[PDB]
Amino acid sequence: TIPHLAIDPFSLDFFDDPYPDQQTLRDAGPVVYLDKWNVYGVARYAEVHAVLNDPTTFCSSRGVGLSDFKKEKPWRPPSLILEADPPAHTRPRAVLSKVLSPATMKTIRDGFAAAADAKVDELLQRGCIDAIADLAEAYPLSVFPDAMGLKQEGREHLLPYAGLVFNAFGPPNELRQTAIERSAPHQAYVNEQCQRPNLAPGGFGACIHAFTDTGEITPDEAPLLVRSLLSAGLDTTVNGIGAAVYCLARFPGELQRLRSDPTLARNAFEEAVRFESPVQTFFRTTTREVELGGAVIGEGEKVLMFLGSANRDPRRWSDPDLYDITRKTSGHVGFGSGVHMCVGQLVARLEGEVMLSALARKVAAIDIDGPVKRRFNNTLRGLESLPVKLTPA
Ligand code: HEM
Ligand SMILES: CC(C)c1ccc(C(=O)O)cc1
Ligand SMILES: [Cl-]
């Protein structure tokens, strides 16, 4: 009853152009079986959303990568939030929610905005730039490590560690095994910075440690929660901002609408997250035999959710393949959905908003003027290089 497909969603062919294969996956049925990796797949919005919103049946504690923690050793100690189920999930989630709250956003907004304005001003002096290295990477590197309260030394390890984390959610292909074999220095750096004495007062890291006396988390849990922000908090935003700039470069009409109303910046970033979905795929593991879209899935089975596909499903979205900065984006799953829905989403949106605001007010045109190069990662979608010419407004 379940169709079997030979599509490898972790192949370079797929990463290069995933959209046709995603339609094939959606149109094959609500649930498919991927023979390449012996996992179930769901690529339609309705089933992805259903799976995300049933954490009892579709759990995270057995890993959200291909590997089943009940069968294999996790490459690093499990995340206390991403790779936990309720009730263990609930208090660490509450702490990170309070750390990355509205009040915190109010304390960092002016600084994030100033840095975004300054970066765009710098880039306009250069005119011809790489929108990845010089903007999508450079801007979050100029604000997030500082907001964490990291020392200056060693920050070159942050993006490699993130690449490793997102590759490690994948199957044991070359991308994954190469990342892990090179991992030791990046892990050593990240783990050390997670300790209380290495995190500057007033930062996100110190704030997590400060919550260790409320009864929500203990002191021994705090380093792993800092590790969650150092895993998830930088490379995601790099690919989100890169997505938005790439979208504005490819859809000049939308850049012109954004210029005419810079208060569209937050939605323009949100629509970039829907349209490119920086985080493409994640797994769950079934805790029982379950019926999903008329198909029966056995206990202890890995289920691959195609978030990018769900965000392009014409069953849910009108003109899904258009970038539309006045689209009603609510309901997209680019930040997940349900109890694990991105706890850093206010930081992500703040970065994206103030950068797109700066572009809207300072830039008249973004023209690609060189070869675009894609970055291949088992979980992350984005570019390696995006040469553009920026015309000042
Ligand atoms: C555009 C940028 C981002 C995207 C697309 C993104 C995407 C996601 C998604 C899809 C999930 C759900 C995972 C799941 O259901 O298993 C998630 C969770 C999470 N994200 Fe984000 N994220 C972004 C930025 C950030 C930032 C900036 C931070 C931290 C400062 C962050 C920290 C986390 C953490 C800690 C979780 C786990 C939450 C939980 O399990 O309850 N993310 N993110
Ligand atoms: C979903 C993605 C952004 C993510 C990656 C790692 C962690 C963690 O290490 O807890 C959390 C979320
Ligand atoms: Cl680690």
β pairing state of 128-130 and 387-392: antiparallel
The stretches of 233-386 forming alpha helices (DSSP H) are: 235-250, 252-260, 265-276, 307-310, 345-362
Determine the Cα–Cα distance for residues 326 and 267; give it in Å rounded to an integer: 7
As beta bridge partners, residue 128 has 389
| Residue 348 Cβ < 6 Å to ligand 2 | no
| Residue 165 Cβ < 6 Å to ligand 2 | yes
**What does the DSSP 8-state code read for residue 108?**
H
Question: Residue of the nearest CA to atom 3 in ligand 2?
Answer: 232
Phi, psi of 111 (to 5 degrees): -70, -40
| Residue 34 Cβ < 6 Å to ligand 2 | no
Q: Is residue 20 within a helix (H) or strand (E), and if so which, with residue range?
A: helix 19-28
Question: Which residues are annotated binding-site positions?
Answer: 89, 93, 284, 340, 342
Nearest to 164 by CA among 232, 224, 226, 81: 232
Question: Residue of the nearest CA to atom 5 in ligand 2?
Answer: 232
Decide: 262 and 363 in contact? Cβ < 8 Å: no
Q: Which residues contact 142 (CB under 8 A, 6 or more apart)?
A: 115, 119
**What does the DSSP 8-state code read for residue 153?**
T
Q: Pseudo-torsion of CA 247, 251, 257, 260, nearest 10°? A: 80
β pairing state of 302-306 and 281-286: antiparallel
Closest atom, ligand 2, to C-alpha of 282: 1
Q: 344 CA to middle of ligand 2, Å?
A: 10
Helix/strand/coil percentages in the chain, nearest 5: 50, 15, 35
Q: Which residues contact 114 (CB under 8 A, 6 or more apart)?
A: none
Helix (H, G, I), strand (E, B) or coil at 298: coil
> Which pair of tokens denotes residue 37?
């990796």
Q: 190 CA to middle of ligand 3, Å?
A: 7
Residue 281 Cα distances to 43, 289, 308, angstroms: 10, 22, 7
* Sole residue written with tokens 């069953």: 315
List, comma-separated, the residues after which the chain is broken, a break being a C to N distance over 2.5 A; otherwise answer none: none
Nearest to 283 by CA among 53, 27, 12, 62: 62
Determine the Cα–Cα distance for residues 236 and 269; give it in Å rounded to an integer: 13
Q: 282 CA to middle of ligand 1, Å?
A: 11
Determine the Cα–Cα distance for residues 341 and 260; give it in Å rounded to an integer: 32
Q: Pseudo-torsion of CA 320, 326, 328, 329, nearest 10°? A: 70
Determine the Cα–Cα distance for residues 187 and 261; give it in Å rounded to an integer: 43
Question: Residue of the nearest CA to atom 12 in ligand 1?
Answer: 336
Phi, psi of 88 (to 5 degrees): -60, -30
Determine the Cα–Cα distance for residues 57 and 52; give it in Å rounded to an integer: 10
| Residue 232 Cβ < 6 Å to ligand 2 | yes
- Give me the sign of the Cα torsion angle 158, 163, 166, 168: negative
| Residue 273 Cβ < 6 Å to ligand 1 | yes
Determine the Cα–Cα distance for residues 140 and 238; give it in Å rounded to an integer: 7
Q: Which residues contact 10 (CB under 8 A, 6 or more apart)?
A: 37, 170, 171, 173, 175, 378
Radius of gyration for the chain, computed over Cα atoms and rounded to the nearest angstrom: 20
> Which pair of tokens denotes residue 104?
């915190």
Helix (H, G, I), strand (E, B) or coil at 59: strand
List, as one string, the DSSP characters of 209-250.
HHGGGTTSS-TTTHHHHHHHHHHHSSHHHHHHHHHHHHHHHH
Question: Residue of the nearest CA to atom 9 in ligand 2?
Answer: 228
Decide: 136 and 241 in contact? Cβ < 8 Å: yes
| Residue 80 Cβ < 6 Å to ligand 1 | no
Helix (H, G, I), strand (E, B) or coil at 10: coil
* Sole residue written with tokens 């691959």: 304
Starting from the CA of residue 279, give the closest ligand: 1
Phi, psi of 279 (to 5 degrees): -95, 105
Determine the Cα–Cα distance for residues 110 and 113; give it in Å rounded to an integer: 5
Q: Is residue 52 within a helix (H) or strand (E), and if so which, with residue range?
A: helix 45-52
Separation of CA 363 from chain center = 26
Q: Containing domain of residue 352, as a range?
A: 1-393
Q: What residue type is assigned to position 339 of the chain?
A: V
Q: At how many degrees (to 10) do helices 235-250 and 345-362 cross? A: 40
Q: Which residues contact 23 (CB under 8 A, 6 or more apart)?
A: none
Helix (H, G, I), strand (E, B) or coil at 374: strand
Best of 80, 89, 161, 342 for a ligand 1 pocket test (most atoms within 8 Å of beta carbon): 342
> Which pair of tokens denotes residue 134?
């010089």
Starting from the CA of residue 190, give the closest ligand: 3
Question: Which residues are annotated binding-site positions for heme b?
Answer: 89, 93, 284, 340, 342
| Residue 231 Cβ < 6 Å to ligand 2 | yes
| Residue 93 Cβ < 6 Å to ligand 1 | yes
What is the CATH number for 142?
1.10.630.10
Q: 199 CA to middle of ligand 2, Å?
A: 20
Starting from the CA of residue 280, give the closest ligand: 1
β pairing state of 302-306 and 39-42: parallel
**What does the DSSP 8-state code read for residue 131?**
T
Residue 28 Cα distances to 204, 264, 305, angstroms: 45, 37, 15
> Which pair of tokens denotes residue 84?
């936990």
| Residue 243 Cβ < 6 Å to ligand 1 | no
Q: How many domains does the chain have?
A: 1
The stretches of 127-221 forming alpha helices (DSSP H) are: 138-148, 158-168, 174-181, 184-193, 204-210
Q: What residue type is assigned to position 199 of the chain?
A: L
| Residue 278 Cβ < 6 Å to ligand 1 | yes
* Sole residue written with tokens 């008329």: 294
Nearest to 239 by CA among 355, 375, 372: 375
* Sole residue written with tokens 């392009």: 312
Residue 217 Cα distances to 94, 95, 207, 258, 340, angstroms: 10, 8, 12, 43, 18
Q: Is 339 exposed, middle or buried (0-12, 13-18, 19+ CB in 10 A)?
A: middle
Method underlying the structure: X-ray
Decide: 291 and 268 in contact? Cβ < 8 Å: no
CB atoms within 10 A of CB 3: 13
Determine the Cα–Cα distance for residues 163 and 172; give it in Å rounded to an integer: 15
**What does the DSSP 8-state code read for residue 197?**
G
Q: Pseudo-torsion of CA 156, 161, 162, 167, nearest 10°? A: 140
| Residue 136 Cβ < 6 Å to ligand 1 | no
Residue 223 Cα distances to 121, 143, 227, angstroms: 37, 21, 6
End-to-end alpha carbon distance in the chain: 57
